[PDB]
């Protein structure tokens, strides 16, 4: 009866991980690596957004 909730919650942490998106890209499956922001007026003034798999 604990295991029923510890499985439903482990399925839920993976539901957050594939389901969360911005602009239709997943954020926290770990495919959001090397994703540069461009934060100034010239060719390549980056900040890099990197998230591990959650």
């Amino acid at each position: 009866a604990v295991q029923q909730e510890i499985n439903q919650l482990a399925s839920e942490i993976t539901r957050i991980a594939s389901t969360t998106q911005f602009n239709t890209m997943n954020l926290i499956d770990g495919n959001f690596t090397s994703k540069k922001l461009q934060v100034g007026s010239l060719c390549g003034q980056a900040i890099t957004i990197d998230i591990s798999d959650m």
């Binding site: 602009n23 239709t24 090397s34 540069k36 922001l37 461009q38 957004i49």
Partner: protein
């Protein structure tokens, strides 16, 4: 000399009037390139997905 200098002056104004057409046509090449820089700056952001950069 007077008759020649008057055609010469009228030719320098045909020259100024010509230049003002070119100088005015490039005035919107700037508005188009100022817009293409601003668009290219928006597209250089890795929050845009493929449908946004097309």
């Amino acid at each position: 000399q007077v008759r020649g200098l008057n055609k010469a002056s009228d030719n320098a104004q045909d020259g100024v009037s010509l230049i003002q057409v070119a100088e005015g046509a490039l005035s919107e090449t700037h508005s188009i390139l100022q817009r293409m820089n601003e668009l290219a700056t928006q597209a250089a952001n890795d929050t845009n997905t493929t449908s946004d950069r097309t």
